[PDB]
Amino acid sequence: GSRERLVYEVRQKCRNIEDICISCGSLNVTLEHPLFVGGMCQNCKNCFLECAYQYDDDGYQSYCTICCGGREVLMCGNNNCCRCFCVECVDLLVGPGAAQAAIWNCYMCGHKGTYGLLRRREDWPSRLQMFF
Ligand SMILES: [Zn+2]
Ligand SMILES: [Zn+2]
Ligand SMILES: [Zn+2]
């Protein structure tokens, strides 16, 4: 429960989110997460690279935008986007209960950029370019 605990101490202000991997909870941050404020480890960098823009037969992305996994997910209704966010990531990073309330424009498409501890990066489009 490493990611849960690290996020718990972000909220308690004992830790900076930029110092944790927001995907897996590794403290071995190698990089800035290109979409959201928070760190990312190398293993998750490779996951992101490998999983990015893989699609399921439903026409929505196969893997959660934050963690690269997920079963039950929220799916973006912006057809230029088609991203998914798993319910566990949403409840962890936005806050408890936030997944079932969301159940839609996703966190990348919404007007607001801040949702709980989840904060969209202003230069995200050009960060992905750098990332890839
Ligand atoms: Zn990681
Ligand atoms: Zn996830
Ligand atoms: Zn979207």
Provide the residue ranges of all domains of the chain, joining segments of one domain with +. Answer: 1-132
**At how many Å resolution was this determined?**
2.3
Query: Would residue 75 be called left, alpha or beta, if left means φ above 0 and alpha means ψ between -120 and 50 degrees?
Result: beta
Q: Cα separation of 123 and 126, whole Å? A: 6
Q: Cα separation of 37 and 42, whole Å? A: 16
Ligand showing the shortest atom-to-Cα distance for residue 25 = 1
Adjacent-strand bridge partners of 36: 120
The alpha carbon of 113 and the centre of ligand 2 are apart by a number of angstroms equal to 18
Contact indicator for 123, 34 with CB cutoff of 8 Å: no
Contact indicator for 65, 108 with CB cutoff of 8 Å: yes
- Which technique? X-ray
The alpha carbon of 74 and the centre of ligand 3 are apart by a number of angstroms equal to 10
Q: Cα separation of 72 and 88, whole Å? A: 9
The alpha carbon of 13 and the centre of ligand 2 are apart by a number of angstroms equal to 23
SS (H, E, C) the chain: CHHHHHHHHHHCCCCCHHHCECCCCCCCCCEECCCECCEECHHHHHHHHHHCCCECCCCCECCCCCCCCCCCEEECCCCCCCCEEEHHHHHHHCCCCHHHHHCCCCCCCCCCCEECCEEECCCHHHHHHHHC
Q: Cα separation of 71 and 78, whole Å? A: 20
The alpha carbon of 69 and the centre of ligand 3 are apart by a number of angstroms equal to 17
The alpha carbon of 26 and the centre of ligand 1 are apart by a number of angstroms equal to 5
